[PDB]
Amino acid sequence: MDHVYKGQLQAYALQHNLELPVYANEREGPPHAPRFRCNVTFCGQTFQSSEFFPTLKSAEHAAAKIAVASLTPQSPEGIDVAYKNLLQEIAQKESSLLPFYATATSGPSHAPTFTSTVEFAGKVFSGEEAKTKKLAEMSAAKVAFMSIKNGNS
């Protein structure tokens, strides 16, 4: 909604050690026909859409959205595959140690269930229990990651 996009791009420049990003604001158009053309200058490149936005921030958002989407190609993965990758990202960043996925099987011979646990940073979290590994792990990485955030300090 807000310039949240600027906070993302700016973050990349910080880690990549690149000149701070610069946006261009332009407003022109009749009262009932206002147009906000905003451009984003990055690495000597100005990205812009072919359609004008009815709102200012809408332009800045879309402008950066195009830029940040251009960097993705660098190394895409999408956490929509295996949160396992995410857990590995924090491990390297936190200089900790690759998590430890432990799957234990137990329960009645008629309705057998499984339990998955992840030990990272010396802390072991317990995911939900069910007759499925996917959900088990999902609930495990979910509770673990959420715990890491510990809300907004």
Q: Class by helix and strand content? A: alpha+beta
Number of H/I helices: 4
Number of domains: 2
Strand order of the largest sheet: 1-2-3
Secondary-structure element order, as H and E?
Answer: HEEEHHEEEH
> Got a strand count?
6
Distance between the termini: 23 Å
CATH structural fold name of the largest domain: Double Stranded RNA Binding Domain
> Residue share in helices?
25-40%
Query: Could you give a short account of the major beta sheet?
Result: 3 strands, antiparallel
The CATH class of the largest domain is identified as Alpha Beta
Subunit structure: Heterodimer with DRB1 or DRB5. Interacts with DCL4 and cauliflower mosaic virus (CaMV) transactivator/viroplasmin protein. Interaction with CaMV transactivator/viroplasmin protein inhibits RNA silencing ability of DRB4.
Protein name: Double-stranded RNA-binding protein 4
Domain DRBM: 4-73, 82-150
Organism: Arabidopsis thaliana
Task: Indicate the topology.
Elements (H helix, E strand, L loop, with lengths): L3 H13 L5 E3 L14 E4 L2 E3 L8 H16 L12 H10 L7 E6 L6 E8 L2 E4 L6 H17 L4
Antiparallel strand pairs: 1-2, 2-3, 4-5, 5-6
